[PDB]
């Protein structure tokens, strides 16, 4: 408790500081693509989307040390930018970054979603057809994930971003500035985010749903209880969320607490009244009664991105209704963090999310004119995971 | 602000009907309104050159009012003006595509394409260029067919 309250502080020389600047754990991000089996049946006859999952396609991520690390002696905060990098692991993958898949045409779904002005839709329709773009396309893994110049967007006469991709941009970018408490003045505050980009709120959501709560989930304040709700901010889903105690687990001789992401975080205001301010509209959500999805369009420049759990785990039956081929499994598709309760350090985790795009019918865009319903289209799902190294695990029980 | 129907519906209907009327001037009174080099005054054509001249001014005025409501749209793409917007929309190839998609008459498109080709199209848009061309044809009409009973 005494040696802990000092080696847990985020300042130069402590065990938490070295592991904070650059983690001893190798982090991998595995992708599974939802390969569309009946693109023409969906486009022409408004049938269900038959998908086959293809993966894993594995990348080593979060291997870069934190940058522009600057302590503020006044408020006891420490600032940084976390640089983004992904290195492909052919050794750990089912195929090459060149593998082809039939997937939703991202630019078509997004432009149709964003531009509702009928004169604009008429220009866009002409451009979609001149570039012979359609509701679905064939893309390599490298393109779908990291970016491609869209042939339709390239023709748009008003300013648009012509490069499209699920994680475009990624390399050479950095998430921040994060300002976190170093815990010098009070250990119960170590690593909790003070501000992210100079604010305490995201300006994405209304009321309490906009708050930046907790740490980055790489560690939590020390002396964690089983009764504790752990709050944490995840910039990739653009909101703060929480984890709750599940079971006791032994990781390489280290007694840890397994915290999970509860289905309730994903519930509608019908099951969970606090989630009202995560409901963005009243049509797709069916008057805010659908659940297990998150419309993050406000943080994605208006693009109709919907985040969910893999295979729509913990989701409303109406959300899964238009897709054939999914098989949700609690054990397989949930998110969990294994936390060492004394230090508060995350020694293992699996962050499992699915990326979807909503596509609606259109009166003017011919390529979406035959649609008879809206679709929350699963694009891919991922498992971002890391486990403590054997050496670090034995160094942990000895030095801690 | 409101037209007989939605602004979008009205806009294309007006554009279509004016293009059709421009063709119907030749289909009905082509003995008067033509591009024939041979400038011989035809009896009773003067009257028709005046009605055609009147129509051009009526459409020029109607068009001004339509452009004015277009410039009042509050959902146009960012960093793009209402005029670049209008101009893109009325460029010959897109104009003919929208008309065909709405009316489904390919031959009507053939006639319009011919009319625009002969107008130097095939005060800023295609419609404006055409209404300017129409003003010159009705002026040429009156210079040839100066009197209802020539001379
Ligand atoms: C990241 O999360 C993935 C999804 O949970 C996970 O893959 C899944 O791993 C389990 C094994 O742990 C596989 O299930 C196995 O279950 C029985 C019993 O051994 C076997 O009969 C099965 O054939 C299978 O091997 C899941 O099938 C597998 N799911 C998929 C879609 O691949 C990853 O392993 C996690 N990543 C890391 C590196 O931990
Ligand atoms: C890890 C969670 C974040 C998920 C972000 C996924 C982003 C998908 C965006 C696809 C691009 C669509 C085309 C853009 C066209 C336009 O903006 O007009
Ligand atoms: C020592 C390495 C630490 C790295 C730990 C990163 C853990 C981040 C956990 C965030 C989980 C929340 C996002 C997933 C939500 C979802 O499934 O939709
Ligand atoms: C669409 O439905 C019809 C039957 O109504 C069928 O003949 C056709 O093959 C279907 N289209 C596709 C692309 O599957
Ligand atoms: C971080 O540090 C570098 C040092 O070369 C500096 O030039 C740069 O401005 C800093 N980055 C940001 C985005 O503030
Ligand atoms: C990102 O950077 C890594 C390391 O330099 C490289 O292996 C990878 O190919 C890059 N990704 C893209 C999409 O260029
Ligand atoms: C993907 O398709 C392109 C175009 O047909 C092809 O060049 C490439 O080889 C394909 N990928 C694989 C893994 O074969
Ligand atoms: C330490 O911080 C927590 C909030 O993180 C607060 O509730 C607590 O009262 C603080 N303790 C002291 C001794 O100031
Ligand atoms: C963040 O938003 C909540 C509104 O729910 C508000 O109470 C809080 O003061 C805001 N934070 C700051 C520092 O503006
Ligand atoms: C953030 O924390 C406050 C205080 O506990 C809470 O009222 C709010 O609902 C939380 N917001 C999110 C989005 O978790
Ligand atoms: C459903 O929407 C209507 C307004 O369209 C509203 O009266 C009703 O209370 C909403 N129901 C719920 C439970 O949100």
TrEMBL record, chain B:
Q: List the disulfide bonds.
A: 32-45, 41-150, 49-141
Q: Which residues form the Duffy-binding-like domain?
A: 10-148
Q: What is this protein called?
A: PfEMP1 variant 1 of strain MC
Tell me which species this is from: Plasmodium falciparum (malaria parasite P. falciparum)
Q: Which gene encodes it?
A: MCvar-1 PfEMP1
